[PDB]
């Protein structure tokens, strides 16, 4: 029915209007400080005034960093673009890592576009060409105009068309009784299919049948679709137009990433900068998220310094676990969190605290309620002690298998004997190391 992987019980930060964090809300327990800290981040993202600002939240393992980084994305909403990214994903064989980093940087921000289109659609009743008897000296033979009637459920209307848009219809091979789609803006004609009433004419037919379109004839509609700037760049790099035999093989070839010049990006920023002035478009910032930033090379760390100073630079949040360690790509350099100090100077530091045992006992409870299973309190206490003795994420993993043993024992509720049986079949890391040390071949 529903799938739950170590998540989906967090519906947001759950902050009040004053900014104070509740003791427990939205599947989140404790960590009032880190919650209040991220709410102001959400407010700054909604403010739209700041660009390139970055805030780093660093804490120990299983302290709730990432779980919070999903909660801020839940707080922003579906309209605000959110791009998840991991440091190990930035390395690509096709293009240098730098173009991938700057690429995601533009993938974070997004833009909305609104434009109005007017379309005539309906079944073709009678279409006739109109030829001019005047030679005019320009052409040997042509048509002055083409009149095509359109039938729809609400009403019927006759249209007067130019010979070109009629030539498109001749390319579509449209015949009397077939529904067509004619748009005024681009002037493109598309045949949807043959009308449904004509289906009974033949016993066997290849063509599909569709009902007659609702609406009088003419329709006025606008499209509010929002599109990121990077998608405008990729659509700008590969044209979809043209009938040339070269363009066909260009569509056949696999898309290969390439380094985009700064000039094209500047032109896109120019046309968007004009459309935002006309009011036809509205630019909105977005949030970039990077996990395990410590895996980044010092080259990407250095390029992040110049990337954050750009005006179009979106807000980026970083999360790291390890303490002071050697930065990747550096020989003797030792820096906290695995980030160079020049970059740490630019960011803002947020620290994540561990969880008390009594909080862990509630975490197992909520994970059980979202898991829908049934846990006894006496076994709940033992599961809490077990989670505190080994790790917090090990008990949340222990909730899964016990449900199966309970079904084999037919008991609806988990019993202490069930989890005690589950502990022998499944071991954590500490026991695995102990048994690993003494054995013949690598345990």
């Amino acid at each position: 029915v529903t799938r739950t992987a170590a998540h989906t019980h967090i519906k947001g930060l759950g902050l009040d209007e004053s900014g104070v964090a509740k003791r427990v809300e939205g599947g989140f327990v404790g960590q009032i400080e880190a919650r209040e800290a991220c709410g102001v981040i959400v407010d700054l993202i909604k403010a739209k005034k700041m660009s390139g600002r970055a805030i780093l939240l660093a804490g120990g393992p299983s302290t709730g960093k990432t779980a919070l980084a999903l909660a801020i994305s839940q707080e922003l909403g579906p309209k605000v673009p959110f791009c998840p990214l991991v440091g190990s994903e930035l390395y690509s064989v096709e293009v240098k890592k730098t173009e991938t980093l700057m690429e995601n940087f533009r993938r974070a921000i997004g833009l909305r576009i609104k434009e109005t289109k007017e379309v005539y659609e309906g079944e073709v009743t009678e279409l006739t060409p109109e030829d001019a008897e005047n030679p005019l000296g320009g052409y040997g033979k042509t048509i002055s105009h083409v009149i095509v009637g359109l039938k729809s459920a609400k009403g019927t209307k006759t249209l007067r068309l130019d010979p070109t848009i009629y030539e498109s219809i001749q390319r579509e091979k449209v015949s009397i009784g077939d529904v067509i789609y004619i748009e005024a803006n681009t002037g493109a004609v598309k045949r949807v299919g043959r009308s449904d009433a004509y289906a009974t004419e033949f016993d066997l037919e290849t063509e599909e049948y569709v009902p007659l379109p609702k609406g009088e004839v003419h329709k006025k509609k606008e499209i509010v679709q929002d599109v990121t700037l990077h998608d405008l760049d990729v659509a700008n790099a590969r044209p979809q137009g043209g009938q040339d035999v070269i363009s066909m093989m260009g569509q056949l070839l696999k898309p290969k990433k390439t380094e985009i010049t700064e000039k094209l990006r500047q032109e896109v920023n120019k046309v968007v900068a004009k459309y935002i002035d006309q009011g036809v478009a509205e630019l909105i910032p977005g949030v970039l998220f990077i996990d395990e930033v410590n895996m980044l090379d010092i080259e990407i760390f250095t390029y992040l310094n110049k990337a954050l100073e750009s005006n179009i630079a979106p807000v980026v949040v970083l999360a790291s676990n390890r303490g002071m360690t050697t930065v990747r790509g550096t020989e003797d350099v030792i820096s906290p969190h695995g980030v160079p100090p020049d970059l740490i100077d630019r960011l803002l530091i947020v620290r994540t605290l561990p969880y008390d045992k009594d909080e862990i006992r509630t975490i197992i409870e909520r994970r059980a309620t979202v898991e829908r299973l049934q846990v006894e309190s006496s076994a709940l206490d033992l599961l809490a002690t077990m989670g505190t003795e080994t790790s917090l994420r090990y008990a949340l993993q222990l909730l899964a298998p016990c449900g199966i043993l309970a079904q084999t024992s037919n008991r609806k509720e988990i019993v202490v004997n069930d989890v005690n049986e589950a502990k022998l079949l499944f071991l954590d890391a500490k026991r695995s190391t102990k048994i690993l040390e003494t054995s013949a071949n690598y345990l």
Partner: protein, 447 residues
Amino acid sequence: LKSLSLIAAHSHITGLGLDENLQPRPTSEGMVGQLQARRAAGVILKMVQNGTIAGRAVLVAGPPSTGKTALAMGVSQSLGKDVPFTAIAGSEIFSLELSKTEALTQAFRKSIGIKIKEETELIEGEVVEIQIDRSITGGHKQGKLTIKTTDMETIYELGNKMIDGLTKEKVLAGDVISIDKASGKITKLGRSFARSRDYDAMGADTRFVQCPEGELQKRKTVVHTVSLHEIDVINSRTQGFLALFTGDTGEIRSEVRDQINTKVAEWKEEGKAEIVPGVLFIDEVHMLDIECFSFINRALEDEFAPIVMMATNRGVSKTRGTNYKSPHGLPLDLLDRSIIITTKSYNEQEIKTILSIRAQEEEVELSSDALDLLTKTGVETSLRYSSNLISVAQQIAMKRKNNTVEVEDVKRAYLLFLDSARSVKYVQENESQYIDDQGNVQISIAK
């Protein structure tokens, strides 16, 4: 204003604060302090605006957050439009598609620009009537067409080859077209306004424009600004303009570059094209390969070398690609031909002006006592730090809904977000919790 309005690291800096005597003002043109460094930058500014010298390098030195990046950026703003400027990073020239040598050659090529002017003679006017006789006699019977303009109307005789040329791009008249004088090329601008009411739905090619005004044929010159790099990419490929936008250059052979240099030389001899000396700025050059250093040493001596400025905050350290440690992070050969400009750390008095001048940019009203705590924390921390707190305290004060940012909101903003110095302590005490270089970590709290 044409650029996107989203605020950047330094949006306040516009131009340089030097007068005609080059003496810097204490606070002007968006910047603050750094008098000697700003004057040393303005000497480079007039050095570029003069354009009589080429092939020189200059270095900007200083510790982190000393204003080295806001310095070269101020030079590009005072330099103005139409003067080509290239700002890249040393880490960006490492590419799998291009070799570092050629990738740096393109970095030197984009900076220097070229302005080309061209004159055109065209005949543009609206058409009235077009007559072409066919079966009356035969064989190009010399038809005549009447072109109309608002202030002038004449009749033109059409030749046989023009009769054949008018058939392609067929014209019914009632139309505005333009014919090239030199090549006899026919171009169709679009239909007049009287033809708009004929069809309810019309094709995408159709359009309506006003009748051209004035004389029928005119003499007009057009100016274009194209960098040498664009010329080389265009000449390297059958279609190189698409290679510009797709970003795949293909590592142009150095053989074509000499031919392009001879072409530019001939264009300068004829006087049709003049060159504008450009500027090249490389940020964070402390990480660069030695091959790039040597290729910079050689490539700086050519006839067209854009003026190069760079900023590196590393002290004496090992260069990338070699075991030994050269001073400044650069080989002594690159430091031999160069000029070093040093920047000094700001004082307390200047920091508060750098703060308030930032609140004017963020449009955040501050109390008189807020700059005191933000400046006090700004001295112990780095100037680049409290500038973020000036942004967060605006939102925290926005939750309280009242006007300017109060001091208590600044204290809460400092309490929620840790300083870089405090995180080191919190890590050092909690070390057992965080992962270690050796990979050892204690997950369980219970002992």
